[PDB]
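Budget justification note: compute hours in this period were largely spent on complex prediction jobs such as the one shown. Inputs:
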Amino acid sequence: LTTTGTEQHDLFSGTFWQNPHPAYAALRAEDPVRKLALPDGPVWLLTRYADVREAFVDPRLSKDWRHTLPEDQRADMPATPTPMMILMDPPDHTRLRKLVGRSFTVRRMNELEPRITEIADGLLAGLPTDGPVDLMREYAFQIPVQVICELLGVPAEDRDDFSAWSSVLVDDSPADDKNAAMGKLHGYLSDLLERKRTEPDDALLSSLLAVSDEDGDRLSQEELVAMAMLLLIAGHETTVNLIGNGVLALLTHPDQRKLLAEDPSLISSAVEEFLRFDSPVSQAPIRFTAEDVTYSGVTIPAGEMVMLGLAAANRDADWMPEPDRLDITRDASGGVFFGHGIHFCMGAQLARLEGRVAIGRLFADRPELALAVGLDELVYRESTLVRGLSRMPVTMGPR
Ligand code: HEM
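Corresponding output:
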């Protein structure tokens, strides 16, 4: 629907998709705990930073879908549709992350910088010198999935096929295409595991197979494929939009772009602001209420679905002073863009690394980069959990 009073802004419909921020601010001020009638049913939205951050660590906001279901029917059901950690609660979540963390290390993420810088340069060389091009499809879409390929150790021949299948999930609409692309990804990854079981290498897939703890416990076929699938889902579309929204932020702010060109080393700090200013994960994945929770005088009953407004919260003036202004020189301190608590983005370090390499190399390579269309001529994807551009037409300019 829409907001109410003073002046009303569209929600998850119409004008919302071009700029959801005026709508986000109205909610924060007038209506911060709101049951929203969506296509996929009724979900609650928390928009105030303080509530969002609290909700993240509150155990009463569970990742278990069974909390919607009555008492006597929960014994029947699995805790998860697939054994992914983002859908799991403690202590099951604790064991899974502990075991994957033995392979998906901050070191391994950081070790990819040379391989990341290669992928970026390869696409930059493949972009035209003269004339307009689509920066989303021809650059922004391509970096993350190829980083994910290097991570998992997907064969070089099949990398372009892998890239295409994942892009169908990122893409706007068709559902059957999204359901079948999942199918041949899940097929390819499961197939790949067994090939790495007899021919191992230095890549993450082969690394995850051999993982043990103190007790001698490991990962089975189910969990390994589910982790592979999650790494791709949670790390492709999300990273694409950090690159996308971040480049947009610079092109639509001539002052800040001057600051970065005159001082390239600001890029690490710049990424941090792009994540706060225009958060690619607009709302966090669904949480379910185990018991009744109260926020801003509104009680969400037990069994309801809750989304945490990350993009909204990151512009709360109670947290951040002058929060609508883009300042790359800022100090992040507690941006809920990577989440907060037990579920905090497990690939967050890879995400920042890809963020600085993609955005930093591009503006170095193409200093006279410009938008090819007006800001109101830009089209965003109409998806709940994402803020992101379907296309970004840019002129590369001379030199
Ligand atoms: C800048 C881009 C990214 C953003 C904004 C982002 C955001 C998030 C957020 C908000 C969560 C928590 C979801 C929740 O609490 O419901 C999350 C979880 C996760 N992200 Fe990311 N992410 C990004 C990139 C990546 C990358 C590159 C990877 C690695 C391939 C990754 C892997 C994960 C995983 C595995 C989780 C689940 C952690 C857990 O629950 O134990 N993400 N991400």
